[model samples]
Structures are given as C-alpha cells and as structure tokens.
Target: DDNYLVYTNYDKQANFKDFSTFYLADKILVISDSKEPEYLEGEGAEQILAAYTENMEAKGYQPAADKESADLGIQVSYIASTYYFTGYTQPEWWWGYPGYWGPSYWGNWGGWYYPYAVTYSYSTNSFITEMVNLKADEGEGKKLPVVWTSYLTGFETGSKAINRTLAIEAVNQSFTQSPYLTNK
Candidate 1:
C-alpha cells in the first residue's frame, strides 16, 4: 500500500498557457459525478440527485425532465486513485515571475504547492445534443477546449506524484499530519 507514490511534475507554464488560450475561444463541457449514495442506487435510482441539482444550478445549466428534451445526457462513472503525488517543487506563480528566488525568501503567494491524489470518473454520452449544447453554451466547440475532472481525494499537488518512496512517506506522514487518508 505504501509503494505507489511516485509521480512526474507537470509544466505549469505550459498548463497555464494552454488553459488561458483555451478559455479565450473554445467551448468546454465538464461532466462530474456527485458520488452520492442516492445516485448509485438501483432501479431508476438517483444517488447524487441533490448534488446534481446544486451543481447544475451553480453552472447555470437548466434541468431537463427527461433525456428527449435535454440538450446533453451525461453518465458518470466513479474511479478511485491507488497512488498519490506532489506537484512541482517550487511555487506555481514563480514559474514565470521573478523575485522570490532566495532560500530565505520562500514566496508565500504561490498557487497549488502541495501533495494530492488524482481521482475522477469518466463520462460517456450517446447523443450529440449534449455535445452541441456544451459546445454552443459552455465553449466546447470554439477552439477544441480540454476537459479535466478529478476525484475529491485531495489537492492536485504533490499527491499526484505518488510512487513507492512517496507512498511510504505519505503513510508515515499521515500518522502525525493526517492519521486517516481521507482528505483530498
């Protein structure tokens, strides 16, 4: 269990640049599973019905009574991560900006600088209406935008780079910092 915590750091500069450019012109679609027990029940059950309602409202998506009237139908599958890793060693903002370079001056105003796990569900769709709606309303067809989803395992930092060594370290650290591996 403690032998899977190694990971490679991603290029934040590229990530930021890509996201910024994508957001400027592309249409995007984001499908997330509420992971609530109600939605996972059997026989026409709705596990995350409440969470779904809340999420839709937050994203300004109008609810459709059925699939026929809906612009998009999204089916979400849940997946849990087996490993965790950390993000880049330095602060996120420090990538392009200069100033906080010295050892004594570890910048305080940086973005996402910690360890985390990667967990998310994959969405599958059969119709084009949802795709079309996502493209037209959510910027899915403007510039070929990328969609990202992750589980609520923890922060998207160091935990993503989980390997053997890191796994052990994480387990050891959890004893004092987080006795239970429940935060994400």
Candidate 2:
C-alpha cells in the first residue's frame, strides 16, 4: 500500500514581516519587452499568468507601458530549480512481487527473491515570480507595489508543492483586517 500526506515543512518556512511596512496600494504596470509573450507561450505560464492577472485586476491596478504614466512596472520571470537523488535505494520490502506457495514449505523457499536496487532520479521544479521596479520618470519618489510571489516544489512522485504557505499566510493575516490593502 502507498500513502501520501500533505503538511507544511518547518524547514521550508518563510515570512513577510519585512514587507508589512511598505505601501501596497500603489498601482503597478505589467510590462513585456518581447512580443513573444513568454508566459502565454510556455507550458504552465498561461495558467499562472491568468491567475496573477485576475488577482491584479481584482486589486484595481491597470497595466501600463510608460513609467511616467504608471505607478509601478512589473516584470514577470520564470525560474527553474532541480533536485537530484543519487545512489538512492529503497528496502526490498518496499517492492511488491508475485510469489507461489503450496503450504508445504516453511523455510522461506516458497517465494521468489528479488534484491533491492539503487537508482538515480531527478526532478525539475519551476516557479513564477515578479520583479517590481519603479519607472525611470517616477524616480525615487514612487511607491512600488509588492505583487504576488509564489514558490513551488516538484518531486519525482508527480506532485507539485508550494513552499510559500507561510508567506501567503502572512498576506492573509494582514489582509483580514484590511481587504483593500494593495501594495503592502
């Protein structure tokens, strides 16, 4: 039998205390220098960007091109992280095998034997994060917004897990009191 459990990992903890003091109400512009539209063309990029855009639209910010004409400009980028398991092995009991017995043998000679083996495997994980930069014309006086930030972890078991539960919790913790809070 195989079992799976989902829980937060204490080792993967994250916090957003440093971002609480910033003004989150500032409007931000979503920029795209390349016409190819990386997110729209990539594999999971469309879904991610759609969610992000929906979230941004719900926040009442419009995407703009000119810095002087916008409050903030956001550039979305995709990053990949990979984990490799080398020389990894599981116990012989972990594998399921077929065996035959006639109830005549009690010396462990009724079943076929299979040795435990070691193997190497690798998994690739990717996440989308945004970089917030003030427009050149806005100079140092503009307040940039803190947009959506999510982290995901992939495993060979075919599972996609997020590492930003705490970070999202922080957002929820703050937003509960002030739903209108934008850039914070």
Candidate 3:
C-alpha cells in the first residue's frame, strides 16, 4: 500500500480524438513547503518528462513545436513534501445511500452499519500531470478547460534513483490506464 500508486480522471464530455498535439512545459512545477516558488530540473526531470512524451507519441499524439500552436497543453506538477496528509473518516455505510438510511426509513433495521473504519493516507510524494484543451476558444476571463488529470503518488523516500524509477513507472501507468486519451 506504500509503493507506487496511479490515479486518473478526465472530462468525459471532451472528445479525445479532436486533439493531436501537446505542448509540455519544460520544467515541472514544484509545490512544496520551501516558502518560495521553484521548479524541478536536470536528468531526473527529463526522465519524468520523457515518460509522458513517449506515452503521448505512442498514443498517436505529436509534440507541438511551441506552446501557443499546440492543440493540447500539458503540464506536470511535482508534489515534493511529507508535511501534508489528509484522509476521510468513512461513515458507517461507507458507500452511502441515495437518501437517509436512518431507522426511521427501515423499521427495526438497526440503522446503517459498517464492519470497520476505513482510513487512507496521501502524504507521499506525487506527480500530477494535466492536459487542457487549447483548440477551443476561451472567453475574456474564462479559465482554461482541463481535459484530463493524472495523480501519481506513493513513492518511497531515501533513495533518489529508486524514487525516480517509481515516478517514471507511475507516469507511464497513468497513460496506460487512460485509454481514452488518444488522438487517433
């Protein structure tokens, strides 16, 4: 449970086949407790970026010559910190019901019940990659519409090489899971 984890979400309304090229930022944004804005660089960063590039090409998407000309905008954010952790305390019936499932609804049902408490953590390092629609025109103040997002976490600490390997694997896994993010 503390190894590599990959999670992805996408806007179902957007048609993936419409986008062809992507412009990925050169540097990965670093969101941490460092008190100042920073970006990741060097060989490790290239490895992470390469993973996405390889996957995009494999999916029939080309790398745009420049950011402004791309049909899709891609960016990567590296969450490098351990000080942040959040979890939810699942209710008695974790899945929950369409409406209130109190005893008032069911006579002598003894109320909602669950076997045990469910807890999870997200304090590990993570790599979040997002793709946005560039072909659609935006309003004066409208936000860029995001098409897909991938959350890759659960990296172990201590070794730089190992963590890099894990990050690459997770990044590739994210693309693997999202079969709908293809241009062809």
Winning candidate number (lDDT):
3
- Number of backbone clashes in candidate 1: 38
Query: Once superposed on the true structure, which residue ranges of model 3 sit more than 4 Å away at CA?
Result: 82-124, 158-164
lDDT of 1: 0.25
Model 1: per-residue Cα lDDT over 52-130, one tens digit each: 3444343445566543344323333222211111233332212221221221111122222223223222113200001
- Which lDDT values do the candidates have, in the order given? 0.25, 0.29, 0.64
Candidate 3, position 13, lDDT:
79
lDDT of 2 by residue, 46-120 (tens): 444444444454455555444334443333333222211223253221111112111111111222222212221
How do all the candidates rank in terms of lDDT, highest first?
3, 2, 1
lDDT of 2 at 146: 28
The TM-score of predicted model 1 comes to 0.25
TM-scores of the models, in the given order?
0.25, 0.34, 0.72
Q: Is candidate 1 or candidate 3 better by TM-score?
A: 3
Comparing 2 and 3 on lDDT, the stronger one: 3
Alpha-carbon runs more than 4 Å astray in model 1: 1-39, 42-47, 80-148, 154-184
Clashing pairs for model 2 are: 24-182, 24-183, 24-184, 25-183, 29-72
